[PDB]
Subunit: 102 residues, 4 copies
């Protein structure tokens, strides 16, 4: 009984959004998106995570992320929708842009 509408698997809109973040992979049932970000070291990884943290608390939409030294393993979905919303793709896009710097 998720209070929010999720983007339906393979919906034209979902796919139009995915196209903007092509290095993320859609998960089974299209219920989330995943990307493992790789940096040279922890210092770079934290620099990246820092910008995402600011964005996340500003839009109040947070990554499920697993950091191990130079690696940041990320899965995005909207809990209140039990799946993907526009906020996940907007978060993925910001993350992609912040990582592009490295």
């Amino acid at each position: 009984m998720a209070p929010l509408a999720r983007l339906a698997a393979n919906s034209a809109r979902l796919l139009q959004l995915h196209k903007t973040v092509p290095q993320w992979h859609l998960t089974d049932g299209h219920l989330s998106i995943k990307r493992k970000f790789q940096f040279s070291d922890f210092n770079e990884a934290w620099g990246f995570m820092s910008r995402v943290a600011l964005y996340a608390d500003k839009v109040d939409h947070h990554p499920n992320w697993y950091n191990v030294y130079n690696t940041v393993d990320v899965e995005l979905s909207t809990h209140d929708a039990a799946g993907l919303t526009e906020k996940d793709f907007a978060l993925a896009k910001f993350m992609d842009d912040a990582a592009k710097n490295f």
Copy 2:
């Protein structure tokens, strides 16, 4: 130097960080930290990040909003070292503030 499962030093170190859970084979220690919100969790993580890069010893941590799910082990040792307990302790102290 790798700490053997149930070794005297491991058990002694573990007493300094009693909220941590020894894992199968004593290959790692785990603690899940919980805060009021992400802002608090990030303030916590920020202090740990600084410590981690200073001593060059890094957590395996999974953050979701207000929680930080942490597993510590020495990657080059295939088990626990002193550095893991030292990090666990720094993390405990940083968490106390909240």
Copy 3:
């Protein structure tokens, strides 16, 4: 809306953040925070950074190791607004943890 020097609202807000010092013309409020070390100061600043970008209201802060010398004012207002006192309060609360 810009708070006029010595206005009733300014003085009332100032009571919620008594460690802050009103500046000449009541154009800003200042507080210098002190911590044990940089690690603590950075943990403090990190929480404030998150708050600041959330509400889109930023401190004028000068950090040297363990100290954070802070002046707050609303750049578009040429003086103090509610947002400055709200930020001052968030900063006070973040500092309390240390």
Copy 4:
């Protein structure tokens, strides 16, 4: 009575180090170096400061920095030397590299 030796003003070594960080400016008496870093927004500035913070606590050598939204105004010197040392230029260089990303 500074416990540490500072690099003498105009010393060949000072100048050889300054050459590596050409956008920093030497201060009167060559007692410090200064650079005002400019970013697009606070989010970028904090991303930058974050990496420098990690470096600073690792080498235990900290900037005197004044952040105002998208701007980071920095002055580096070694207090225990009452002037510049190699650590200031190594810090400036790291800062330059972290900022280059933006």
